[PDB]
Amino acid sequence: CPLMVKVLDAVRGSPAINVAVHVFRKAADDTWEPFASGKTSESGELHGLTTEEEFVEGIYKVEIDTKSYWKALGISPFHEHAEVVFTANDSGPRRYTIAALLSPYSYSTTAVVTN
Amino acid sequence: CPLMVKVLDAVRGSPAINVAVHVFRKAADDTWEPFASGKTSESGELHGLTTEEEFVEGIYKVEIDTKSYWKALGISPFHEHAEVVFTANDSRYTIAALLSPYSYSTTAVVTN
Amino acid sequence: CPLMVKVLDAVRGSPAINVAVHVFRKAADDTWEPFASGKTSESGELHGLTTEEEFVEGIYKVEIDTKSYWKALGISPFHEHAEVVFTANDSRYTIAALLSPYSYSTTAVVTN
Amino acid sequence: CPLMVKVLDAVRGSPAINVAVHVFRKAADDTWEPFASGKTSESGELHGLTTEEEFVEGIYKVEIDTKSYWKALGISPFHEHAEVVFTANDSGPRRYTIAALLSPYSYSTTAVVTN
Ligand SMILES: Oc1c(Cl)cc(-c2cc(Cl)c(O)c(Cl)c2)cc1Cl
Ligand SMILES: Oc1c(Cl)cc(-c2cc(Cl)c(O)c(Cl)c2)cc1Cl
């Protein structure tokens, strides 16, 4: 599991369940190609997006579909989605945890990078 | 005015208005003595808490009554209040707080 | 000026100065077209990006070049940049970003 | 484990290891009495502070000793510590995760409350 996403809801003090996450990788022609996608579990975690073999060096974008999440709760939020863009594995394989904390008008994101 | 407080609401995307703020300074006996207080304005700001003369080096606590704020909006919050504790050293302090029911963040902007 | 950007540095407790910001609007073909840009001032602020006439309803992206900022301070950052994507609907927008090497937070303050 | 603390470092993108945490409970005479204390592990987590039996209703304060953490890294930080104060178990036992994300001039805290 070299790439894991964890999403929390700051309004309810709970994991953010069933949030859609789409991951893209920047291709040789500077286009974002689809890489992986999934939905957060009841623990607000998304595991198994990729493998070490497939997760090569590159620029990745993790798009978290926050708008759909808040709308399904009857809240009209500010952002369309939360986007996290980073270079990965540029000095060898690392494990990446991307965490996001969500509110209707704000969000925070962090990365925990281990090896 | 060397100390300013700004409070924002992350749920509504607005200044947090009418939020009570109490400032304390740590006394000789390790007690917190009341120092300054007020309620944030329409812009979520609290200006004029103190003066350069009075704002001597020391340890200060800024207590933001976040519970009352959320209760007024009909939302059940987690925290009793938010506290920011820091040392003022000489060499302007903006204490900002961003509020959600189960989370808050605070940052200090120290300028000049 | 219906759109303002403010950027703060959580490592140094200061405005984030000289940070390039690019604003894009989503075009008819789902493309991002350049809309406005600038560099934050000494107060970490970027004013005068647009006018009420030009700032029509639509989807906008604000891209903050956080990587260059951290590189200038000799700190290796995680993110390529920070992006804030939102719909402007009619019924002033302050987009604030708080920057650390491996983390950032952004909040919108929508007033009037 | 009804009370867990997790602390992350936003400067290094790593868990915050060896951070001291002191927990207090408000006593009948409105004094803060010591309740539990510990240090975060290599994963930035602190488990085993208390038991369900001991963790009764009350107002608790979780003090995270952030100043010592940053000083040991050669950074002179703004805050003396981060404090999280909350009523616990007021409608029955809950499990509380207190998370903090740390930077020298800022911090964020969240609670995940489950049952
Ligand atoms: O003027 C300000 C505006 Cl607009 C926002 C913040 C601010 C404060 C905190 Cl804590 C945040 O997490 C974010 Cl994202 C912005 C601070 C100042 Cl000083
Ligand atoms: O397990 C975790 C828990 Cl509980 C909380 C956060 C987490 C994530 C964000 Cl964005 C935060 O601002 C804070 Cl304070 C904690 C991260 C992980 Cl990985």
Q: What is the 3-state secondary structure (H, E, C) of chain C?
A: CCEEEEEEECCCCEECCCCEEEEEEECCCCCEEEEEEEECCCCCEECCCCCCCCCCCEEEEEEECHHHHHHHCCCCCCEEEEEEEEEECCCCEEEEEEEECCEEEEEEEECC
Residues with Cβ within 8 Å of residue C30, at least 6 apart in sequence = none
Four-residue CA torsion sign, A26, A28, A31, A33:
negative
Query: Using a 6 Å cutoff on CB, does residue C50 contact ligand 1?
Result: no
Q: Do B37 and B20 contact (CB within 8 A), yes or no?
A: yes
- Phi/psi zone of residue A89: left (φ > 0), alpha (ψ -120 to 50 degrees), beta? left
CB contact under 8 A, B103 and D108: yes
**Pairing relation of β-strands A20-26 and A32-39?**
antiparallel
- What gap in Å lies between CA A15 and CA D95, rounded to an integer? 13
Counting from 1 in the atom list of ligand 2, the atom nearest the Cα of D109 is: 14
- What gap in Å lies between CA A20 and CA C50, rounded to an integer? 33
Counting from 1 in the atom list of ligand 2, the atom nearest the Cα of A101 is: 10
Q: Give the start-to-end residue ranges of the domains of chain B.
A: 1-112
B105 is in an annotated binding site: yes
CB contact under 8 A, B102 and D84: no
Cβ neighbours around B92 below 10 Å, total: 12
Q: Do C1 and C48 contact (CB within 8 A), yes or no?
A: yes
Method by which the coordinates were obtained: X-ray
Strands (E) in chain A, as ranges, are: 3-9, 14-15, 20-26, 32-39, 45-46, 58-64, 79-88, 95-103, 106-114
Which residue, judged by its Cα, is nearest atom 16 of ligand 1? B96
Cβ neighbours around C71 below 10 Å, total: 12
Q: Do C11 and B108 contact (CB within 8 A), yes or no?
A: no
Q: Do D83 and B85 contact (CB within 8 A), yes or no?
A: yes
- What gap in Å lies between CA D28 and CA D32, rounded to an integer? 9
Q: What is the CATH number of domain B1-112?
A: 2.60.40.180
Q: What is the CATH number of domain D1-115?
A: 2.60.40.180
- What gap in Å lies between CA D43 and CA A89, rounded to an integer? 21
- Phi/psi zone of residue B44: left (φ > 0), alpha (ψ -120 to 50 degrees), beta? left
The residues on B that touch D, with CB distances below 8 Å, are 59, 78-81, 83-87, 102-110
Q: Which of B98, B102, B105 sits opposite A11 (nearest CB)?
A: B102
- What gap in Å lies between CA B13 and CA D110, rounded to an integer? 18
Our mutation pick for probing the ligand 1 site, out of B7, B98, B104, B110, counting the most ligand atoms within 8 A of Cβ, is B98
> C71 — phi, psi (to 5°)?
-60, -40
CA angle A70, B75, D45 (to 5 degrees): 75
The amino acid sitting at A42 is E
**Pairing relation of β-strands A106-114 and A95-103?**
antiparallel
Give residues (CB < 6 A) around ligand 2: A 6, 8, 97, 99-101, 108-110; D 6, 97, 99-101, 108-110, 112
- What gap in Å lies between CA A82 and CA A107, rounded to an integer? 8
- What gap in Å lies between CA A106 and CA B76, rounded to an integer? 19
Tell me D89's DSSP state: S
> A71 — phi, psi (to 5°)?
-65, -40
B54 is in an annotated binding site: no
Chain D residue with minimum CA distance to C104: D10
